[PDB]
Each structure stands twice: as structure tokens, then as C-alpha cells.
Amino acid sequence: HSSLHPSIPCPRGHGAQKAALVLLSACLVTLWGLGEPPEHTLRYLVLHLASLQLGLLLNGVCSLAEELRHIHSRYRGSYWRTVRACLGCPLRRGALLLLSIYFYYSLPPFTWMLALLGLSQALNILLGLKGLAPAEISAVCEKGNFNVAHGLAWSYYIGYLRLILPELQARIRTYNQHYGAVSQRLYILLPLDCGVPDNLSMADPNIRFLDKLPQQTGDRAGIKDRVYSNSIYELLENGQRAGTCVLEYATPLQTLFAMSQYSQAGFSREDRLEQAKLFCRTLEDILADAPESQNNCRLIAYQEPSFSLSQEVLRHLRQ
Amino acid sequence: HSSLHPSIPCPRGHGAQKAALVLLSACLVTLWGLGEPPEHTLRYLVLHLASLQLGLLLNGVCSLAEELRHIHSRYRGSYWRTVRACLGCPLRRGALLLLSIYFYYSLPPFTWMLALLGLSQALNILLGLKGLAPAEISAVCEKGNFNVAHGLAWSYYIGYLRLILPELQARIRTYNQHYGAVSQRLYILLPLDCGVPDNLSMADPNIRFLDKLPQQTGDRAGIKDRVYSNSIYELLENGQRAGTCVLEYATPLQTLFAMSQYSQAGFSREDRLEQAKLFCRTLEDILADAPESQNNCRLIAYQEPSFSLSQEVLRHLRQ
Amino acid sequence: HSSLHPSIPCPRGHGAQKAALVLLSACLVTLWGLGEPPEHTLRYLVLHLASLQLGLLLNGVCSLAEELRHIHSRYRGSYWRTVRACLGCPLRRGALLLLSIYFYYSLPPFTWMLALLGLSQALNILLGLKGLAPAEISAVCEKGNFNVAHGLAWSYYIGYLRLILPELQARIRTYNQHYGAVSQRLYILLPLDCGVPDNLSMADPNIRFLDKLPQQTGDRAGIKDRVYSNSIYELLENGQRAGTCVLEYATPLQTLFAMSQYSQAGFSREDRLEQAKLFCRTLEDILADAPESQNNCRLIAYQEPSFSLSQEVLRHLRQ
Amino acid sequence: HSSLHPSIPCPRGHGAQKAALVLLSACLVTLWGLGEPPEHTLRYLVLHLASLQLGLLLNGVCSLAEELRHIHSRYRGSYWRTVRACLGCPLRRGALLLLSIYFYYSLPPFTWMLALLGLSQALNILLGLKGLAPAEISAVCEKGNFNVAHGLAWSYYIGYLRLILPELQARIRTYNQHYGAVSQRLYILLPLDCGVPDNLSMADPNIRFLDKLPQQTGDRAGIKDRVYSNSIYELLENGQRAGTCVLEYATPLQTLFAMSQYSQAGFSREDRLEQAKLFCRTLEDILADAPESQNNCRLIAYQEPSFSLSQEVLRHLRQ
Numbered sequence A, B, C, D: 001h002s003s004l005h006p007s008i009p010c011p012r013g014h015g016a017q018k019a020a021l022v023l024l025s026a027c028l029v030t031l032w033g034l035g036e037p038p039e040h041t042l043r044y045l046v047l048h049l050a051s052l053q054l055g056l057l058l059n060g061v062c063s064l065a066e067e068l069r070h071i072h073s074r075y076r077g078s079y080w081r082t083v084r085a086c087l088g089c090p091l092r093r094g095a096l097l098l099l100s101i102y103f104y105y106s107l108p109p110f111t112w113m114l115a116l117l118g119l120s121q122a123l124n125i126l127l128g129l130k131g132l133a134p135a136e137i138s139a140v141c142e143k144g145n146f147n148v149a150h151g152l153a154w155s156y157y158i159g160y161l162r163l164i165l166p167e168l169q170a171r172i173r174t175y176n177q178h179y180g181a182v183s184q185r186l187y188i189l190l191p192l193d194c195g196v197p198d199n200l201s202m203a204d205p206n207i208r209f210l211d212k213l214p215q216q217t218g219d220r221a222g223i224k225d226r227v228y229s230n231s232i233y234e235l236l237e238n239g240q241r242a243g244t245c246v247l248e249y250a251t252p253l254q255t256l257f258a259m260s261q262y263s264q265a266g267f268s269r270e271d272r273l274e275q276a277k278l279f280c281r282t283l284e285d286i287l288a289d290a291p292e293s294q295n296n297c298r299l300i301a302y303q304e305p306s307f308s309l310s311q312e313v314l315r316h317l318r319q
């Protein structure tokens, strides 16, 4: 579980297998209750599996007819690789295909069934009735790491955090020696609504500015002397400076909000919220596992519902 | 067909429908040739479609028994939302289920078949069978914009290009008047190999640095005075200068490479190449559709072979 | 039972044999209670063992059809070597096969059963099934010293300890006479978490540096004058010095951690913890059996919890 | 394939599946020829698979009786985790087992067969006849990355090479500016026989010494100012200095050799050769993929059979 916000979803578990197992148990109980010859049950089961295998093969060939079109580009110009990418491991599929043909043409017409199955598959493809409901798509995307969040979070870590966090204590110490009473941790805010305002004081008058840390330099992607700066914002409580930190927004949230605004992104508000949660979780995990985040960064996430950003930041601070 | 670099893959086409159509035509011809009553054909076809609908329903029931765990977080507590997410369209799926059961019991036991289908689906779930082939999952993710690259490219546009392209002409003009004359285009390199060395001179000593453009500042996500810079690189040729332009590496390529290197990311080298290529395509498209791209920047794409970066960039400069 | 740290696992025992024995006893009792002619029992038992031998033979034939590709490289071209590597002991396995077939045909078709066994073994191989469970593979690898740690620990002994422990007393004596008196033992830290920060003071400011021991040189793997050094660390306590000793981090832990981080290694965090623990055990064993360990060095092991490294190392120093 | 040495084995392929497939085809053809009721063929095949599942459970419980002894240490004190690691995914295995019981007790005595299988498994465990032939063990260890080589190579990279390679060119340039005509690549030697001599000139009088590079420093594992030096050997051809390089031996080879010499390692000479090849291959792969090894080292491997190390090094050099 993530302590950042109760609203963060935990990774998908194995409850699906539990449900499948209980369903299978009840199902066998019902088969036993009916009392039909279990051999006939088994035969019909294996026949159904064979039919499903044939259907999968036909869907595969349908996709293959077009995956060939990209052979030179997407599949590095190798027909065998295209077949692998389309029908799965060719050896396993071929073996199952052969076994299915044997157990159909053998057990108690094969050509007629093949025709009917092909017709059904073609109908499924043409009508597009075949497809995955949102739950399956989301599960595959999370398990396969296909979510834009994943990418944005890994960028926010590798590109920026991995270079600033190690030097953060040094920069803070130098600034304090040269001059207030700042803490020694970058406080990054994650507005789950992706309502990032450019002017930080715009969010709350209590959030004001004190000074800017010395610009940190470094070569990056050929733009040498690229500089990553920071802003030491001061927490104005009861009209008083309760505390000064290095408060920050996670830039990728702005990116998500914008691509939600635009059209070509093909990205919707519910997706904005979903990817925001996923980004928060992934970044949390990365920082927790990585060493460079040794009490140098604190992640704050707040659900806009009234609301007092300054008080929440102060709460996380005094803790 | 893409134009950036020949290996870039064009978007998937509607060919699969054509393949299914030709398959349907051949299947109908052979079914007619077989010579059996069409009433039996329709009967078996509708029964088989009912079987698929029941299987999908049971798969949805299992996925729901899973997702109800996260209902509170991923679905705001609205049960109907989870049901929609799992079963598909509740109204359409329910209507199809009702029609299926009606026709089966009407058309020439029943609970036995339902049990057998449930058992088959349970085996499929338990033994980890319902896994889409790489091609199909690729198509789905691309269609739904579920790509690691997509987010990175959209950030790059919204977060660097959209903010540097406009003032780029002003910065170039100021440098030219202050001072050998750089070109009026920002040249971005898109190494498919994703090497992205830190300093240009390392990759090709024929490329040399000259000066920096005027630093551009601005307020961005809490930090104000966030200053974006550049680095004019002198393009030598056989020991002589033959052009000057603002050269660049697409940092998201650095992100992709580092992601590939690391392990927690769960990312693969094949995925690295594929995602980088998709990034190039998406950046090209968005830039072409971006009004700020008034020929202010040129995207350079190349793959490792022998190969001289300086010669290729000069060749592109000749235009 | 290990003594370094309570969580360290002792080597696997023969408990599996005891479980097999009790199971055999119970099975024989129940078989006797069932009350059938022992001749049938022996017939079916030997038939089943023959079936297993045939299955193992066929699996070996397939593995041979694979390994003959590498015969030239991994086996020096000696066909008999490959046959031994695949089928097991050629003489013993051949004799068991001959006895099996003789009894099989003798005892109350044949080729049909052989083909069925071949079908079973085929499916097992193709579908991807004959995979050992994690516990069994762990036992096998530990028994055969197929462990990532094993090599690292053996290097650490042969390559640092065996070459520093002897002259360590001389170096300590020289430093003491030159100049607060360090102890006569090398204290090696074994962080199971594998954090291994570069500088001790980072982990615990209570630990401070005092001076370095005399550098030891030597000829090693081409590089002569290869010099191994140390770093005496002052052990403070509540702002006061209470001991000095040559603190040390077991470097191979750095290798394990970085391996876990990287992806090309194909290494997992669970494997990281397991291998680090095995490394501690193996280092303890080798060191105890090493004559050079005349109480010249103490192995310190600890796990993250709150926890103070300085306090624990001092507690060990009290001995 | 590895260009280092023809003797290096390539990674194990998929030929095993090819052999399994052809075996399956032959078995099906034989079944068709004998022409037994294919229904009976199935019945017996599925029953055999059920028997295999029962046997696997028995072996698993036998292993569990041992593993439970280590629950607190090697399995983080969770019975469920122990069962998972001993019997595989409990859900899947349990479901297959339940289906097996239903199909046995249903299809054409269950208790008698269970007793017979239990006796067979107990006999297999007690007699130790159950086991993996060398080919399977090697394949699993290599696929699972359990080979000592793997660890030693990853150490040799992360600990040492990753720190010396980036600064190598700088050190060479500084040395040349201060003073011969060395190249810019650290040449590593991999004696496949693990015959590493401490005195490099001992291998060949032609291999003599010129000077030592400036000692490179750096903090490592608390031993700050740890120094990694180098030796600039000079190639003496025809009594003349043909070339000067940074030739060096791969230290882990010494570790492998010595750990072969000792007894507690439980390691044999053929294993020395095997792990030497594996180490060379893994190191080659890692350096090829990593960026830091950008034409900064050249791996040399030579099979001692007469032999002229100097000529081989010169050949690799002038190339």
C-alpha cells in the first residue's frame, strides 16, 4: 500500500485466480451432480480447447497478413520473427495445432467445423465485437509497463532527480553558511488533479518566496553548463514565517494536464487522473528502492476537494 | 510511410478487415460447396457465438471478483463503474447474454454446457492462457496511446519545444547582431541506438563548440527563473569550418536508454528500440501539426552502421 | 544453525529423506490394509518405474539433439561425452533401459505404450513444463555450489583477505610504534541490506576517520606494486571517543547491489537478499577453516530495522 | 557467436523444442498407424498427466517437510511463501491436482493407484535415483544465472572496469604529455586454462615493462583514497620495442584457478575450464552492451596448446 494518499491504487493482485479456482470447484461439483459420463465431459472439453486453438490460429493469420506489411521496419526484416510476434512461440502453437487436428478428426465433420470456426472468427474481426474490456487493458498495461505515467516518472527520476538529489545537501549547506533556517529535503508536490499553477504563490498567499539556491551546473545531452536551479519558498503561517523549505512541483504533472487539454494526444480527463495516480505510485517506488533518495526528498500528494496547501506542507514538515 | 528515416514504421492500417473479409468469402464459398442446409449453419453459428459470449461473461465475473478489491480507489466506489470496466458495456453485454441464453434453450442439456464453458474458461484463467500475442497487444496499445514514448514525446513538445521555438529566432538575432553566422533552425538529433553521449565532441571530433545562445529564463512549475540554454556547435569538415547551427540530442532518448539499462523499470532492449522509433514518429507528427514549427527546427534521425555524424548533419544542412 | 546473525540459514539437511521414509512406511501399511496380491503390486511398480526410465531416456534424446550443436565447443568433440552429459550414466542408464524393456514386454501392446509415453514427454517439453520448483533448484544449486555469492566470497578470501590478514599485524605494529591505539582485528561489515555507502561517516556520523595504515604493495596479475590500503576509523560515542579499529565494508556486497540494480545481469532483489546471506555464510565457513584467520578479523553482520551502526560495532568491540 | 575464441560456447538455443516436436509428430503417426480408439488414447494420456501431477505433489510435500525447518530464515517466516516456493504457484498446482483427482476417480481403484505412486516417489527420493543429468543442470544454471562466472564477471566490471575505463584515456594522455608512444586501450588477457602467472614477464621474455601509469584514486567501500594503478608493458619483438600498451591479466581468473586448487570449494578442473569460458563470454557481452567500453579495451583470449603470447597481442594490436 502507498501511504502518500489513500486514493492511490495498489498493484493488481491474484484475486482473479482465486475466483477462477472457486468457479472451477463449483463447476466440477455441478458436473458430478448431473452425473453424465465423465469421459464424455472430458471429450467435449478437449474438443472445445481444440476449437479455441483453431480460432486463435485464424485470428493470428489475420493479424499476420498485415504484420508482414511492416516486416522491413517493425520486425527487422525476418518473416520468422513476424510469425513469432503474431502467433506466439511458433513451435508451441504448431504442436498444439497438430494435436488439435488429430483429436478432432479422430474423436467423434472436421472440414465443416473448420469452416464454421473461420466464419465466426471473420465475423468477430469484421464487426469488431472482439476486444478487451477496460479492466483487461489496464491490467496488461500495468503489468507490461505501457502506461505514459511509467515513462514520465522514469524521466523525472533519471533526468532530473538523480542529478539534483546527491548535491542537494551540499547546496543547502553552502547557502545556509553564506546566509536562513532552511531544511535539507526537496519537498515535491503532486497535485492529483494536475492543476499545477505556474506561479506558486497563486496557489496560496501563505506560500511566498525567500531566495534562490545557487544554480547547479552540469553537462547534459550536449547542452553543457545546463543549469538546474531551485527556489527556497517560505511557509507564511498566521502572518509569520513558520518554516522555509525547497518546495517544488513535479513538472510532468503539467505535461499530463497539457496533453489532456490538446486533441492529438487522444487523452481524456479520467485518463489524466489515472496516469497521475500511476505516476505518483511509480515515482514513490523508484525513490524508495533507489539509494540516492536517502531522506533527501519527501513526496506530497493532495486531493483537491476548504483546502489549505500550506497547512498540509507544514504538517509533513514538522513531522 | 514515414519520411524521417526509412526504418520508421508507418501506423497500422485497416488491412486486418480485408484479410478477414477474404477469409469470410472463401469460407462461405467452401461451405456452400459442402452442401448442407443453411438452417443448421445458422444454428451452429449462433450457438457458437453464444458460447463465446458466455465465456466472455464468466471472464468478466472473475475480473470483477478481482477489481472489487480496488473499487474504492480506482473506481470512486461506484459499483456500476466497475461492472462497466469489467464486463464491457453492461446494457449491450446483458442484452447479448439474454439473447444467447434464449436462443440456446430454444434451439436444439443447458446447464451442462454452461458448466463445460465455465470449466474451460477457468482453465484458461488459471493456467495463464489468455495472453494476447505481441502483435495484437502492440496494436491495442498503439491505438489507445499506451506507449512509454508517447508521453515522453508529448513532454518534449510541451515543456521544451513549445517554450524555446518562439524565442529561438530572437535569441539567434541577438547573437548575430552581437557578433560566422549560425543558421535559423534548431537541429535535433534522434539517435535510434540511443547512445546520446554527454558531449558532442566525443561522438565526432569533427563537431566543435563555438559559443552559447542568450540564456532564456521563465517561470515554470514553482521554480521561477528556470533558464533554458543552448550550445552553438561549429561544424568542421576535414579541418575546416563549413557551417554553424544549434545542435541537440533529444534527452528523452537518454531517458529511454537509461530506463533500458536499469532493471526496476522492467523495460527491454527490444522495447527500447521500438519505443525510440515510436518516439521519433510521434515527435515528427506533433511537430508537423504544431503551429510553432514554422521551419524553426529540423529533426535528424540516424542509426548506427563507418558512419560520420558530421557528414550527415552537413548533408541535411545543405537543404 | 548459523551464529553470525540469527536470520542466516543453516545448510539444508536430510529431512526430505526422513519425510520420504515415513511416507513409504505409511504407504506400505495402507497397501497391506487394502489386501491385494503382492505380485500385482510388484508388477505395477516395476512397470511404472520402467515408464519413468523411458521418459527420462526420451528427454535425454531431445536434450542430446540439442547439445550436439555445441558438442565441438562445450564437449571437445567427444560424442561419448555428450551422451554422458545428456542421458546420465550411459552404462547404468542403458542397463536400466534394457531391464525395463525386458520386464515390460515380459510382464502382462508395447509400441503403443511407448508412443504414449513419447507423447507425454513431448508435451512436457514443448508446452514448457519440466521446470523445477524454486526450492528444489535452490537445493541443487547449493549442493553443487552453483551460486553467485560462492564465487564472490571465494574471491574475497583469495584476493583480499589471504593477502592482507598476514601483514595486517605488522602494519598495525608499525603504526602503533610510529604514534589512541587501534585494535588488533580487522572488522568487516556485512550489511544484508547491501546499502554499502561509499563513506562510513555518511551512514553514521558517530564514526569518524583518524588515519591510514601503512600501505601494502605486491605483485598481482601483471600489475606489480598493486597496493592494498585501509582506513582507520575513530569510533565516537555521544561525542566522545571510545575505541579505534580498522572498519571495513565487504566490497562484494557492492557488486551484489549493483547487479540487482542493473538489468543485463538478470538478477532479482529476492536473489540479492538470498545471495548476500549465502555470501555471509560461506565467508564465515571459509574464514573459520582458514589458518590465516588467527583471530585477525571479525565479521560483522546486521540488517536494517532506529538502528545505530556505531553502537553495534562498539558492542562487538566490547568482546 | 563470440569472436573471442572459437571454443567459447554459444548460449543454448531452442533445438530441444524442435526435437520434441518431431518426436510428437512421429508419435502421432505411430498412434494413427496402430489405429487404437483415439478416445482411449486420450483417456490414457490425460490419466498419465494426472499421475504426473500426483507424483509432483508427493515430491513437493517431501521437499516441504524439509523446507519448513528454514521458514524463519530462508523464507521470511511465512508458511504460504514456503508452499509457493516448494510446489509452484499454489493456485495453479492445486487446480490441476483437483482436476486430476476428478478425472482419475471418474474415468475407468484411485486409492490403490495413489498408494502405488506414493511408494514410487518415496523409492525415488530414498534411492536418490531421481536427479538431473549434467545437461539439464548446466542449462538451468546458465538460463537462471547461477554460475560463479556470472558473479565474477559482473564484479570485474562493476567494481573495477566501470571506474577505470572512463579515466583511462585521460591517464594515458597525461602520461604521454609528461613523457612514450602507448596506445589508448587497456588490453586484458584471458588465459582459458587459468594459468595466470604473477610475474607477467614470466609468461614471455618479450613481454617487458616500461613504466607505471599515475595511480588513479577514489573512495570505495569506506577505504578512501583507494588507488587503482596500471603497468605500461612494452612488446619486445625481434629484440625491439614493437609496441607499448597497458596489457594486463584478468584477476578473477586467478581466483578461479586457486579456488580450483583448494578443497572446500568443491570445484574441479573441468569446472575451471567451463567457468572460464562462461566468464569470458559474459564479460564480452556486458562490455559490448555498456557504453563505457567504447573502444577502450580489447578482450584477448588464448587457448594454450608452440605458443607465442607476444605475437598474438601484437596481432590484436596492429589490427
Ligand SMILES: Nc1nc(=O)c2ncn([C@@H]3O[C@@H]4COP(=O)(O)O[C@H]5[C@@H](O)[C@H](n6cnc7c(N)ncnc76)O[C@@H]5COP(=O)(O)O[C@@H]3[C@@H]4O)c2[nH]1
Pocket (backbone or CB within 6 Å): A155, A156, A159, A160, A161, A223, A226, A227, A228, A229, A248, A249, A251, A252, A255, B155, B156, B158, B159, B160, B223, B226, B227, B228, B229, B250, B251, B252, B255
Ligand atoms: N524542478 C526542476 N528543476 C529543473 O531545473 C529541471 N530541469 C529539468 N526538469 C524536469 O525534470 C525532467 C528532466 O528533463 P528531461 O531531461 O527528462 O526532459 C526535458 C529536457 O529534455 C528538456 N529540457 C527541459 N529543460 C531543459 C534545459 N534547461 N536544457 C535543455 N533541455 C531541457 O525538456 C524535457 C522535458 O522537461 P520537463 O518535463 O518540462 O521537466 C523536466 C523533466 O521532466 C527540471 N525540474
Ligand SMILES: Nc1nc(=O)c2ncn([C@@H]3O[C@@H]4COP(=O)(O)O[C@H]5[C@@H](O)[C@H](n6cnc7c(N)ncnc76)O[C@@H]5COP(=O)(O)O[C@@H]3[C@@H]4O)c2[nH]1
Pocket (backbone or CB within 6 Å): C155, C156, C158, C159, C160, C223, C226, C227, C228, C229, C250, C251, C252, C255, D155, D156, D159, D160, D161, D223, D226, D227, D228, D229, D248, D251, D252, D255
Ligand atoms: N587490474 C586491477 N587493478 C586494481 O587496482 C584492482 N582493484 C580491484 N581489482 C579487481 O577488480 C575487481 C574489483 O574488486 P572488487 O571490489 O569487486 O572486490 C575486491 C575487493 O573487495 C578487495 N580488494 C582488492 N583490492 C582492494 C583494494 N586496493 N582496496 C580495498 N579492497 C580491495 O578484493 C576483492 C577481489 O579482488 P580481486 O578479485 O583479486 O580483483 C579485483 C576484482 O576482481 C583490481 N584490478
Ligand SMILES: COc1cc(C(=O)O)ccc1NCc1ccc(C2(C(C)(C)C)OCC(C)(C)CO2)cc1
Pocket (backbone or CB within 6 Å): A046, A049, A050, A053, A088, A092, A093, A096, A099, A100, A103, B127, B129, C123, C127, D046
Ligand atoms: C502453457 O500451456 C498451454 C499453452 C497454450 C497456448 O500456447 O495458447 C495452450 C494450452 C496450454 N496448456 C493447456 C492444454 C490443455 C490440453 C491440451 C490438449 C491435451 C494435451 C491433453 C489433449 O488438449 C487440447 C488440445 C486440443 C489443445 C491439445 O492438447 C493442450 C494444452
Ligand SMILES: COc1cc(C(=O)O)ccc1NCc1ccc(C2(C(C)(C)C)OCC(C)(C)CO2)cc1
Pocket (backbone or CB within 6 Å): A046, B123, B127, C127, C129, D046, D047, D049, D050, D053, D088, D092, D093, D096, D097, D099, D100, D101, D103
Ligand atoms: C502451463 O499449464 C500447465 C501447468 C502445469 C504445472 O504447473 O505443473 C502442468 C500442466 C500444464 N498444462 C498442460 C495440461 C495438460 C492437461 C490438462 C488437463 C486437461 C485440461 C485437458 C484435462 O488434463 C488432465 C490434468 C489432470 C493434467 C489437468 O487437466 C491440464 C494442463
